[PDB]
Amino acid sequence: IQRTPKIQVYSRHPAENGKSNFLNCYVSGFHPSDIEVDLLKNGERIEKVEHSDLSFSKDWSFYLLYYTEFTPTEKDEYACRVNHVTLSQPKIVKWDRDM
Amino acid sequence: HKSEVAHRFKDLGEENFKALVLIAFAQYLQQCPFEDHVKLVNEVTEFAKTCVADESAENCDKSLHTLFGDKLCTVATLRETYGEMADCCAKQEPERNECFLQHKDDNPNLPRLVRPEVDVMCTAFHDNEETFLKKYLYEIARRHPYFYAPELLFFAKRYKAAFTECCQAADKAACLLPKLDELRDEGKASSAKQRLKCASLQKFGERAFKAWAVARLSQRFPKAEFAEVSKLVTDLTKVHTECCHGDLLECADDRADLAKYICENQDSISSKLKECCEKPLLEKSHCIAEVENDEMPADLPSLAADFVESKDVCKNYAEAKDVFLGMFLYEYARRHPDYSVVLLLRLAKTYETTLEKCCAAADPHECYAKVFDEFKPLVEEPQNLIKQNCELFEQLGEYKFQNALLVRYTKKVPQVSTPTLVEVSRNLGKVGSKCCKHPEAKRMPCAEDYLSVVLNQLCVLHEKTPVSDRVTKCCTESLVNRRPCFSALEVDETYVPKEFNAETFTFHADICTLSEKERQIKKQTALVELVKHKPKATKEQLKAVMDDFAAFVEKCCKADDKETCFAEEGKKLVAASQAALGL
Amino acid sequence: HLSLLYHLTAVSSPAPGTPAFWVSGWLGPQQYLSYNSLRGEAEPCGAWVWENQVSWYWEKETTDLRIKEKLFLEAFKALGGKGPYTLQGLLGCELGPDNTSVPTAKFALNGEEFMNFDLKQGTWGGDWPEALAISQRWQQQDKAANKELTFLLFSCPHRLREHLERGRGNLEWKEPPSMRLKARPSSPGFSVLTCSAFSFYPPELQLRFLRNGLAAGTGQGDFGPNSDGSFHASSSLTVKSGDEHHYCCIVQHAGLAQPLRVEL
């Protein structure tokens, strides 16, 4: 009846500085379907962000993949920012390099 | 007669009966295995024999539709193996048969017939012959549920003739495959002409078909009087109405009687019928359907006499619209065997529009004196189109031609699915092979006849699964103006273009197994898809991006570790393509 | 063993420019189809654009999903009351032993299962008042029951067979994961080990931790999709600082001839 999102951020391939990759953000397990997801480079939103069809799982909860092409550098910091009916205020998830 | 089953069986004879019934079931139940149909046919036959015996016996009073119905609902599974067909067993006659008729060829797309090897066929033929021929009837009937039952019987005699004439040869393939391949080609054209005949009747009305028939017969029998061409048009209408509604037994009979009427009255119809009328039941009707036009009369007055100069034009038009206009097609038709029937009907249409408006005018004669001017553009436009299209077909391949059409139709009608587009082009494209051979005079009519059949195929299927408004409109507005409607259509600016992404050109390395025939269909697919990404794309850009594509495929199949390439270059071909298109 | 499943969704008041209704079609875990109320047309997704497919297949899909659109948007009339709604349906079929299909037809209102379609009686069912309302509106219609029967007992399994033949290439695809195991100082005398699997298909995959050859269980697992139909996974474990180089991580997956021991 009202579920809060689960936010994972991960690169498509293992991160290597200077080599081209994709950064994914995977918002999942939420209800209802309205959700705002923005990818952040160094705090500010990227505009070449593509995203998959809004879909749902066995348990009826919705899910969604936002993703961008990018070449990580050592200095650069990325993050995913999600708003949804069930969240006090935008939640921002930082891209852990390892996961 | 109390029993219709009895009547037909008597008239048609047993062997034709069993065939027509087997066709009947094949056409309705297209996936029921062969053996089953034979049981059903044999059941229905044996029932009939008991009414040829006693016409008042249990159930012989029933109509053919009730009996063939009752029997088709024997297989109740229907839903699991056919779909919305089962919904029909719910209903009662006559709504029931209308249902069964709507639900033929929802699925054209049934497995292809891989021909067995010529020797295995000649085995089977020499062995159980009687069956081998039934399997032909069944296999053809079920892929062409509107195939003209009586002609199919004749094709079945030709099939048998080919094997009778060729299985005694050392090189059987050299002898036979040519004959079977012509017989297949005649067949596919016949099925198509007949599907237009039934669409005409069902979806457009008796009026529309009669107009066609009058135009058509008048070309072939230019010395017959209008009074005679009508009686024939009426007879032909009954016959076709009947095999289009599935009454195969009745329509075969009636066709027989028509051939018999034609021969008995040869003198008032055509001098070219002498040879034909001396043949056996089945080849009589084919001959007469296929024979040469009679030579046209001596000193026919100008078409202006009756239709523009006469002071009775509006009188007659007011008194008998459909008769008068029939006279028009008859008089025009007999003067012009060269023109296509489609074209003559368009001309009659303009004539009628004109009279409609002009008889309402202050001075009607003044208004329509120059009606024949209006026909000049209706004749030129088709000649110009076929002329351009035959130049294009020489100057480019059969292949490169299809691509030209595929891009053309995808821009008009991008809402249609990629595989449907590829196919419709391949068939339109076949108008190069078929018609540009013929000489000047004869090209446009060949073209228009063939195109009008190909498009009707598209329309009959589109109506059951609508996806483009533009197709619906062209298909619906006028039967006789389909071709020019489609030609008139510009780039569809309503369409919201597909967008690109990294994954747009995603291929696993299974594409290098592919034959050439196979890999060309794939190119044609990528072509359609590029247009759907930007419909206003010019020929220049399109070939650019398409060369890039073929560069890609050649490159990646020629690498160690294939899937590194696809994975890595798959996005670069996308990047490439956006540049080469604008975005 | 795989299955064709449609993910129908309708909402009672959509963010403007958003669709009222939309469908995603799946073969196993791959999305082959995509549809919505704005565009009005069923389209192939991903590698399924390149499927060796027959004419009219797609516009048959479109035709069917439009009937579904009408039905779903009708449901909200039946419900009446205020609070926004979300109606979901999971419809499909899976192949069984004897050249046999097994169908599915369940629905959820505002995220809770509430309604279903009994293929024996040809009727929708469920006993919440909301489900009785919708169930009734659908049952008395342009033979909606019959079309749902044909869609599940006839169309769906005929499609599923066709995709298996003409799309082995995609379905039998195998891509083994790139693996990385890394150590991440966390707490006082603690540290987090994170084993990560990148770009693999199919999505079945296990991660396990060993500590000098003996199981340390698993900790938190996490799993997701990449843009291209492939998948991503990671599993994480708390661990005494300085004791890190004693642990390794083992990974099972259809695309690997044998399980892979992954060092730090």
Short mmCIF file of N, CA, C and O in Angstrom, two decimals, chain B residues 185-291:
data_model
loop_
_atom_site.label_atom_id
_atom_site.label_comp_id
_atom_site.label_asym_id
_atom_site.label_seq_id
_atom_site.Cartn_x
_atom_site.Cartn_y
_atom_site.Cartn_z
N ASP B 185 2.87 -20.83 -59.07
CA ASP B 185 2.79 -19.40 -59.38
C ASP B 185 1.41 -19.02 -59.88
O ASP B 185 0.86 -18.02 -59.44
N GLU B 186 0.84 -19.81 -60.78
CA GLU B 186 -0.57 -19.65 -61.18
C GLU B 186 -1.47 -19.65 -59.96
O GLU B 186 -2.40 -18.86 -59.85
N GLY B 187 -1.17 -20.53 -59.02
CA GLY B 187 -1.99 -20.68 -57.84
C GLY B 187 -1.99 -19.48 -56.94
O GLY B 187 -3.03 -19.04 -56.49
N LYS B 188 -0.81 -18.95 -56.67
CA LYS B 188 -0.69 -17.85 -55.75
C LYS B 188 -1.39 -16.60 -56.36
O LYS B 188 -2.06 -15.87 -55.63
N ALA B 189 -1.29 -16.41 -57.68
CA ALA B 189 -2.00 -15.31 -58.35
C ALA B 189 -3.53 -15.48 -58.30
O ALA B 189 -4.26 -14.53 -58.04
N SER B 190 -4.00 -16.69 -58.57
CA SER B 190 -5.43 -17.01 -58.47
C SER B 190 -5.98 -16.73 -57.06
O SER B 190 -6.96 -16.01 -56.91
N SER B 191 -5.36 -17.29 -56.03
CA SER B 191 -5.81 -17.01 -54.65
C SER B 191 -5.98 -15.51 -54.36
O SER B 191 -6.95 -15.11 -53.72
N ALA B 192 -5.04 -14.71 -54.87
CA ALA B 192 -5.01 -13.27 -54.63
C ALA B 192 -6.14 -12.59 -55.38
O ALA B 192 -6.84 -11.78 -54.80
N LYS B 193 -6.34 -12.92 -56.65
CA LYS B 193 -7.46 -12.32 -57.42
C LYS B 193 -8.81 -12.61 -56.76
O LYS B 193 -9.72 -11.78 -56.82
N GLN B 194 -8.92 -13.80 -56.17
CA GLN B 194 -10.16 -14.24 -55.54
C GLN B 194 -10.41 -13.53 -54.23
O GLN B 194 -11.54 -13.19 -53.94
N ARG B 195 -9.35 -13.29 -53.45
CA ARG B 195 -9.46 -12.54 -52.19
C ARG B 195 -9.93 -11.12 -52.41
O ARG B 195 -10.66 -10.58 -51.58
N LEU B 196 -9.54 -10.51 -53.51
CA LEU B 196 -10.07 -9.22 -53.90
C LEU B 196 -11.52 -9.33 -54.33
O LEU B 196 -12.33 -8.50 -53.96
N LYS B 197 -11.85 -10.33 -55.11
CA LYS B 197 -13.25 -10.57 -55.41
C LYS B 197 -14.15 -10.64 -54.13
O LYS B 197 -15.19 -10.00 -54.08
N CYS B 198 -13.74 -11.38 -53.10
CA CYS B 198 -14.54 -11.51 -51.88
C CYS B 198 -14.54 -10.25 -51.02
O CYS B 198 -15.54 -9.95 -50.37
N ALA B 199 -13.40 -9.54 -50.99
CA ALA B 199 -13.33 -8.28 -50.23
C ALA B 199 -14.32 -7.37 -50.90
O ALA B 199 -15.20 -6.83 -50.25
N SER B 200 -14.24 -7.29 -52.22
CA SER B 200 -15.16 -6.47 -52.98
C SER B 200 -16.59 -6.74 -52.54
O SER B 200 -17.26 -5.85 -52.05
N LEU B 201 -17.02 -7.99 -52.65
CA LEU B 201 -18.38 -8.37 -52.26
C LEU B 201 -18.72 -8.08 -50.79
O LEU B 201 -19.66 -7.36 -50.50
N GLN B 202 -17.96 -8.67 -49.86
CA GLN B 202 -18.22 -8.51 -48.42
C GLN B 202 -18.12 -7.08 -47.92
O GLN B 202 -19.08 -6.55 -47.43
N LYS B 203 -16.98 -6.43 -48.09
CA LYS B 203 -16.73 -5.14 -47.45
C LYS B 203 -17.23 -3.96 -48.26
O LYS B 203 -17.48 -2.92 -47.69
N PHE B 204 -17.39 -4.09 -49.58
CA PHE B 204 -17.83 -2.93 -50.41
C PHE B 204 -19.20 -3.04 -51.06
O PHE B 204 -19.71 -2.07 -51.57
N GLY B 205 -19.79 -4.23 -51.06
CA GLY B 205 -21.13 -4.39 -51.62
C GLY B 205 -21.21 -4.96 -53.02
O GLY B 205 -20.23 -4.95 -53.76
N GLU B 206 -22.40 -5.44 -53.36
CA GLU B 206 -22.70 -6.04 -54.65
C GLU B 206 -22.48 -5.04 -55.80
O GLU B 206 -21.89 -5.36 -56.82
N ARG B 207 -22.96 -3.83 -55.60
CA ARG B 207 -22.74 -2.75 -56.54
C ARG B 207 -21.28 -2.65 -57.00
O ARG B 207 -21.03 -2.42 -58.17
N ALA B 208 -20.32 -2.81 -56.09
CA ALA B 208 -18.91 -2.57 -56.42
C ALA B 208 -18.39 -3.69 -57.27
O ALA B 208 -17.68 -3.47 -58.24
N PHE B 209 -18.77 -4.90 -56.94
CA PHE B 209 -18.34 -6.05 -57.71
C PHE B 209 -19.01 -6.03 -59.06
O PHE B 209 -18.37 -6.26 -60.05
N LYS B 210 -20.30 -5.74 -59.11
CA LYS B 210 -20.98 -5.78 -60.39
C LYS B 210 -20.32 -4.85 -61.39
O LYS B 210 -20.17 -5.19 -62.57
N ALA B 211 -19.94 -3.66 -60.92
CA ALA B 211 -19.22 -2.68 -61.74
C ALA B 211 -17.91 -3.29 -62.29
O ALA B 211 -17.57 -3.17 -63.48
N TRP B 212 -17.20 -3.99 -61.42
CA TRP B 212 -16.01 -4.64 -61.88
C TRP B 212 -16.31 -5.64 -62.96
O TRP B 212 -15.71 -5.64 -64.02
N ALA B 213 -17.26 -6.53 -62.67
CA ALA B 213 -17.61 -7.63 -63.58
C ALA B 213 -18.07 -7.12 -64.94
O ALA B 213 -17.72 -7.70 -65.98
N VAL B 214 -18.82 -6.03 -64.94
CA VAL B 214 -19.32 -5.49 -66.18
C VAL B 214 -18.16 -4.96 -67.01
O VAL B 214 -18.10 -5.23 -68.20
N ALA B 215 -17.24 -4.24 -66.37
CA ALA B 215 -16.05 -3.72 -67.04
C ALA B 215 -15.27 -4.88 -67.63
O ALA B 215 -14.79 -4.82 -68.75
N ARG B 216 -15.16 -5.94 -66.86
CA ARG B 216 -14.24 -6.97 -67.18
C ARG B 216 -14.79 -7.83 -68.29
O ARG B 216 -14.07 -8.15 -69.22
N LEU B 217 -16.06 -8.23 -68.17
CA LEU B 217 -16.65 -9.08 -69.18
C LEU B 217 -16.76 -8.33 -70.49
O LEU B 217 -16.59 -8.91 -71.55
N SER B 218 -17.06 -7.04 -70.43
CA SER B 218 -17.21 -6.25 -71.67
C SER B 218 -15.92 -6.12 -72.49
O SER B 218 -15.97 -5.90 -73.68
N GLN B 219 -14.78 -6.23 -71.82
CA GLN B 219 -13.51 -6.25 -72.50
C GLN B 219 -13.36 -7.54 -73.29
O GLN B 219 -12.79 -7.54 -74.37
N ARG B 220 -13.87 -8.63 -72.74
CA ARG B 220 -13.67 -9.98 -73.29
C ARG B 220 -14.70 -10.37 -74.32
O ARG B 220 -14.45 -11.29 -75.11
N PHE B 221 -15.85 -9.71 -74.25
CA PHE B 221 -17.02 -10.07 -75.05
C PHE B 221 -17.59 -8.84 -75.69
O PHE B 221 -18.78 -8.61 -75.63
N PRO B 222 -16.72 -8.04 -76.32
CA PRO B 222 -17.12 -6.75 -76.81
C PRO B 222 -18.23 -6.76 -77.82
O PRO B 222 -18.79 -5.72 -78.09
N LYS B 223 -18.56 -7.90 -78.40
CA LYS B 223 -19.70 -7.93 -79.32
C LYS B 223 -21.04 -8.33 -78.67
O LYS B 223 -22.07 -8.20 -79.27
N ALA B 224 -21.01 -8.79 -77.43
CA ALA B 224 -22.23 -9.09 -76.74
C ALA B 224 -22.93 -7.80 -76.43
O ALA B 224 -22.33 -6.79 -76.08
N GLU B 225 -24.24 -7.85 -76.51
CA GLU B 225 -25.07 -6.73 -76.13
C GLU B 225 -25.10 -6.49 -74.63
O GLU B 225 -25.03 -7.43 -73.85
N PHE B 226 -25.25 -5.23 -74.23
CA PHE B 226 -25.37 -4.90 -72.83
C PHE B 226 -26.34 -5.81 -72.06
O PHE B 226 -26.08 -6.19 -70.91
N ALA B 227 -27.47 -6.14 -72.68
CA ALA B 227 -28.48 -7.00 -72.05
C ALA B 227 -27.87 -8.34 -71.68
O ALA B 227 -28.16 -8.87 -70.62
N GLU B 228 -27.00 -8.86 -72.54
CA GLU B 228 -26.38 -10.16 -72.29
C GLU B 228 -25.26 -10.07 -71.27
O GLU B 228 -25.10 -10.98 -70.47
N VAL B 229 -24.47 -9.01 -71.30
CA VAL B 229 -23.38 -8.87 -70.34
C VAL B 229 -23.93 -8.81 -68.91
O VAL B 229 -23.29 -9.29 -67.95
N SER B 230 -25.15 -8.25 -68.75
CA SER B 230 -25.79 -8.15 -67.43
C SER B 230 -26.14 -9.51 -66.87
O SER B 230 -25.82 -9.81 -65.74
N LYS B 231 -26.81 -10.32 -67.68
CA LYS B 231 -27.24 -11.64 -67.25
C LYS B 231 -26.03 -12.42 -66.83
O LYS B 231 -26.05 -13.14 -65.83
N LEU B 232 -24.95 -12.29 -67.59
CA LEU B 232 -23.69 -12.90 -67.20
C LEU B 232 -23.18 -12.26 -65.89
O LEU B 232 -22.84 -12.97 -64.96
N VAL B 233 -23.20 -10.93 -65.77
CA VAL B 233 -22.71 -10.31 -64.54
C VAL B 233 -23.49 -10.77 -63.32
O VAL B 233 -22.93 -10.95 -62.23
N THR B 234 -24.79 -10.99 -63.50
CA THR B 234 -25.65 -11.45 -62.41
C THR B 234 -25.33 -12.86 -62.01
O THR B 234 -25.37 -13.19 -60.83
N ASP B 235 -25.06 -13.68 -63.02
CA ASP B 235 -24.72 -15.09 -62.81
C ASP B 235 -23.41 -15.20 -62.10
O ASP B 235 -23.29 -15.91 -61.13
N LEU B 236 -22.43 -14.45 -62.58
CA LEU B 236 -21.12 -14.39 -61.95
C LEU B 236 -21.22 -13.89 -60.51
O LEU B 236 -20.51 -14.38 -59.64
N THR B 237 -22.12 -12.93 -60.25
CA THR B 237 -22.28 -12.46 -58.89
C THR B 237 -22.82 -13.54 -57.96
O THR B 237 -22.32 -13.69 -56.84
N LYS B 238 -23.78 -14.32 -58.42
CA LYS B 238 -24.32 -15.42 -57.59
C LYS B 238 -23.23 -16.44 -57.25
O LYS B 238 -23.09 -16.86 -56.10
N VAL B 239 -22.45 -16.81 -58.26
CA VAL B 239 -21.40 -17.80 -58.13
C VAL B 239 -20.40 -17.33 -57.09
O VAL B 239 -20.15 -18.01 -56.14
N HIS B 240 -19.87 -16.13 -57.25
CA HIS B 240 -18.86 -15.67 -56.33
C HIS B 240 -19.37 -15.35 -54.97
O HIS B 240 -18.67 -15.60 -53.97
N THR B 241 -20.57 -14.79 -54.90
CA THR B 241 -21.16 -14.57 -53.60
C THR B 241 -21.19 -15.88 -52.85
O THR B 241 -20.88 -15.94 -51.67
N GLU B 242 -21.54 -16.94 -53.55
CA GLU B 242 -21.60 -18.25 -52.95
C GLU B 242 -20.25 -18.82 -52.50
O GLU B 242 -20.18 -19.24 -51.35
N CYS B 243 -19.17 -18.82 -53.28
CA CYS B 243 -17.89 -19.37 -52.72
C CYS B 243 -17.20 -18.41 -51.72
O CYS B 243 -16.38 -18.81 -50.89
N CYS B 244 -17.57 -17.14 -51.76
CA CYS B 244 -17.08 -16.23 -50.74
C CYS B 244 -17.74 -16.44 -49.38
O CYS B 244 -17.07 -16.29 -48.34
N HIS B 245 -19.02 -16.83 -49.37
CA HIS B 245 -19.71 -17.17 -48.11
C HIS B 245 -19.47 -18.59 -47.66
O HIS B 245 -20.09 -19.06 -46.71
N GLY B 246 -18.58 -19.31 -48.33
CA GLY B 246 -18.28 -20.69 -47.95
C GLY B 246 -19.20 -21.77 -48.51
O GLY B 246 -18.93 -22.96 -48.29
N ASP B 247 -20.24 -21.40 -49.27
CA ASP B 247 -21.12 -22.42 -49.88
C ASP B 247 -20.47 -23.09 -51.11
O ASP B 247 -20.94 -22.94 -52.24
N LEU B 248 -19.41 -23.86 -50.85
CA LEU B 248 -18.59 -24.37 -51.92
C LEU B 248 -19.38 -25.34 -52.78
O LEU B 248 -19.30 -25.27 -54.01
N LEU B 249 -20.18 -26.21 -52.15
CA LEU B 249 -20.97 -27.18 -52.90
C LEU B 249 -21.95 -26.47 -53.82
O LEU B 249 -22.05 -26.78 -55.00
N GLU B 250 -22.66 -25.48 -53.31
CA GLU B 250 -23.60 -24.77 -54.16
C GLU B 250 -22.90 -24.02 -55.28
O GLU B 250 -23.43 -23.92 -56.40
N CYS B 251 -21.73 -23.45 -55.02
CA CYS B 251 -21.15 -22.55 -56.00
C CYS B 251 -20.48 -23.32 -57.12
O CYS B 251 -20.39 -22.82 -58.24
N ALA B 252 -19.99 -24.51 -56.81
CA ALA B 252 -19.40 -25.37 -57.82
C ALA B 252 -20.49 -25.75 -58.81
O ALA B 252 -20.30 -25.70 -60.03
N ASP B 253 -21.64 -26.13 -58.28
CA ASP B 253 -22.74 -26.55 -59.11
C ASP B 253 -23.10 -25.41 -60.02
O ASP B 253 -23.12 -25.56 -61.23
N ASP B 254 -23.37 -24.26 -59.41
CA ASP B 254 -23.86 -23.10 -60.16
C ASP B 254 -22.84 -22.68 -61.23
O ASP B 254 -23.23 -22.23 -62.30
N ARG B 255 -21.56 -22.82 -60.93
CA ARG B 255 -20.53 -22.47 -61.90
C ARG B 255 -20.62 -23.38 -63.09
O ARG B 255 -20.49 -22.92 -64.21
N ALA B 256 -20.84 -24.68 -62.84
CA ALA B 256 -21.06 -25.68 -63.89
C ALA B 256 -22.20 -25.27 -64.82
O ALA B 256 -22.03 -25.24 -66.03
N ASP B 257 -23.34 -24.94 -64.23
CA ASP B 257 -24.50 -24.47 -64.98
C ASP B 257 -24.23 -23.19 -65.79
O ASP B 257 -24.73 -23.05 -66.88
N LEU B 258 -23.43 -22.27 -65.25
CA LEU B 258 -23.06 -21.08 -65.97
C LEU B 258 -22.22 -21.44 -67.20
O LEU B 258 -22.40 -20.86 -68.28
N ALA B 259 -21.24 -22.32 -67.03
CA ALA B 259 -20.41 -22.71 -68.16
C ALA B 259 -21.33 -23.31 -69.20
O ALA B 259 -21.21 -23.03 -70.38
N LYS B 260 -22.31 -24.09 -68.74
CA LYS B 260 -23.24 -24.73 -69.65
C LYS B 260 -24.13 -23.72 -70.35
O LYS B 260 -24.40 -23.84 -71.54
N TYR B 261 -24.56 -22.68 -69.65
CA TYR B 261 -25.33 -21.61 -70.28
C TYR B 261 -24.46 -20.89 -71.31
O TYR B 261 -24.94 -20.54 -72.39
N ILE B 262 -23.18 -20.69 -70.99
CA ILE B 262 -22.35 -19.92 -71.87
C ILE B 262 -22.19 -20.64 -73.18
O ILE B 262 -22.34 -20.05 -74.23
N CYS B 263 -21.97 -21.94 -73.12
CA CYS B 263 -21.78 -22.74 -74.33
C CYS B 263 -23.04 -22.84 -75.19
O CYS B 263 -22.99 -22.69 -76.41
N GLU B 264 -24.17 -23.11 -74.56
CA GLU B 264 -25.45 -23.08 -75.24
C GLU B 264 -25.74 -21.74 -75.94
O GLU B 264 -26.51 -21.72 -76.89
N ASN B 265 -25.16 -20.63 -75.49
CA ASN B 265 -25.46 -19.32 -76.09
C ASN B 265 -24.25 -18.60 -76.64
O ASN B 265 -24.18 -17.37 -76.68
N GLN B 266 -23.33 -19.39 -77.11
CA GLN B 266 -22.08 -18.92 -77.67
C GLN B 266 -22.21 -17.73 -78.61
O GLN B 266 -21.38 -16.82 -78.60
N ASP B 267 -23.25 -17.78 -79.43
CA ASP B 267 -23.45 -16.83 -80.52
C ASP B 267 -23.72 -15.43 -80.04
O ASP B 267 -23.24 -14.47 -80.62
N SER B 268 -24.47 -15.31 -78.95
CA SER B 268 -24.71 -14.00 -78.38
C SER B 268 -23.62 -13.52 -77.41
O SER B 268 -23.78 -12.45 -76.81
N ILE B 269 -22.51 -14.25 -77.29
CA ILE B 269 -21.42 -13.90 -76.37
C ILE B 269 -20.05 -13.76 -77.03
O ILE B 269 -19.46 -12.71 -76.93
N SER B 270 -19.51 -14.79 -77.67
CA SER B 270 -18.17 -14.64 -78.29
C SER B 270 -17.90 -15.74 -79.30
O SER B 270 -18.28 -16.89 -79.11
N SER B 271 -17.25 -15.36 -80.40
CA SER B 271 -16.79 -16.34 -81.39
C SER B 271 -15.58 -17.13 -80.90
O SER B 271 -15.29 -18.21 -81.42
N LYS B 272 -14.88 -16.64 -79.88
CA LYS B 272 -13.68 -17.33 -79.41
C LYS B 272 -13.97 -18.48 -78.42
O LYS B 272 -13.07 -18.97 -77.74
N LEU B 273 -15.22 -18.94 -78.36
CA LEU B 273 -15.60 -19.95 -77.36
C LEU B 273 -15.77 -21.34 -77.91
O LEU B 273 -16.08 -22.25 -77.16
N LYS B 274 -15.53 -21.53 -79.20
CA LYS B 274 -15.82 -22.82 -79.85
C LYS B 274 -14.96 -23.95 -79.28
O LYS B 274 -15.49 -24.98 -78.86
N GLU B 275 -13.65 -23.73 -79.24
CA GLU B 275 -12.71 -24.71 -78.73
C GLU B 275 -13.00 -25.06 -77.29
O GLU B 275 -13.06 -26.23 -76.95
N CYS B 276 -13.20 -24.04 -76.47
CA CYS B 276 -13.44 -24.23 -75.04
C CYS B 276 -14.65 -25.07 -74.71
O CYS B 276 -14.66 -25.78 -73.72
N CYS B 277 -15.70 -24.97 -75.52
CA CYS B 277 -16.96 -25.59 -75.16
C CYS B 277 -17.00 -27.09 -75.40
O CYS B 277 -17.96 -27.75 -75.02
N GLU B 278 -15.94 -27.61 -76.02
CA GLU B 278 -15.84 -29.03 -76.32
C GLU B 278 -14.98 -29.78 -75.32
O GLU B 278 -14.52 -30.86 -75.61
N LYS B 279 -14.76 -29.22 -74.14
CA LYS B 279 -13.86 -29.83 -73.16
C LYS B 279 -14.61 -30.41 -71.95
O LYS B 279 -15.83 -30.22 -71.82
N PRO B 280 -13.90 -31.19 -71.11
CA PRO B 280 -14.52 -31.80 -69.92
C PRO B 280 -14.89 -30.78 -68.82
O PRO B 280 -14.25 -29.76 -68.72
N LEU B 281 -15.90 -31.10 -68.01
CA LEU B 281 -16.48 -30.17 -67.03
C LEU B 281 -15.47 -29.18 -66.49
O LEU B 281 -15.72 -27.98 -66.52
N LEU B 282 -14.34 -29.69 -65.99
CA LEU B 282 -13.39 -28.86 -65.22
C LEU B 282 -12.53 -27.94 -66.06
O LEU B 282 -12.11 -26.88 -65.57
N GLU B 283 -12.28 -28.32 -67.30
CA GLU B 283 -11.37 -27.54 -68.15
C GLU B 283 -12.19 -26.56 -69.00
O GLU B 283 -11.65 -25.55 -69.47
N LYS B 284 -13.48 -26.88 -69.22
CA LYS B 284 -14.46 -25.95 -69.79
C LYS B 284 -14.40 -24.63 -69.06
O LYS B 284 -14.11 -23.60 -69.67
N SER B 285 -14.68 -24.65 -67.77
CA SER B 285 -14.80 -23.43 -67.00
C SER B 285 -13.48 -22.67 -66.93
O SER B 285 -13.48 -21.44 -66.92
N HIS B 286 -12.36 -23.39 -66.91
CA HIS B 286 -11.03 -22.75 -66.85
C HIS B 286 -10.72 -22.10 -68.16
O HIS B 286 -10.31 -20.95 -68.20
N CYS B 287 -10.94 -22.82 -69.25
CA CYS B 287 -10.76 -22.28 -70.59
C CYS B 287 -11.52 -20.96 -70.78
O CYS B 287 -10.94 -19.96 -71.21
N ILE B 288 -12.82 -20.98 -70.47
CA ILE B 288 -13.72 -19.84 -70.64
C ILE B 288 -13.30 -18.70 -69.72
O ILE B 288 -13.53 -17.55 -70.05
N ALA B 289 -12.73 -19.02 -68.56
CA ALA B 289 -12.26 -17.99 -67.62
C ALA B 289 -11.01 -17.37 -68.18
O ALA B 289 -10.73 -16.22 -67.89
N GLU B 290 -10.30 -18.11 -69.03
CA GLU B 290 -8.96 -17.77 -69.49
C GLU B 290 -8.86 -17.35 -70.98
O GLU B 290 -7.83 -16.83 -71.41
N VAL B 291 -9.93 -17.52 -71.75
CA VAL B 291 -9.86 -17.34 -73.21
C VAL B 291 -9.72 -15.90 -73.64
O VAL B 291 -9.96 -14.96 -72.90
#
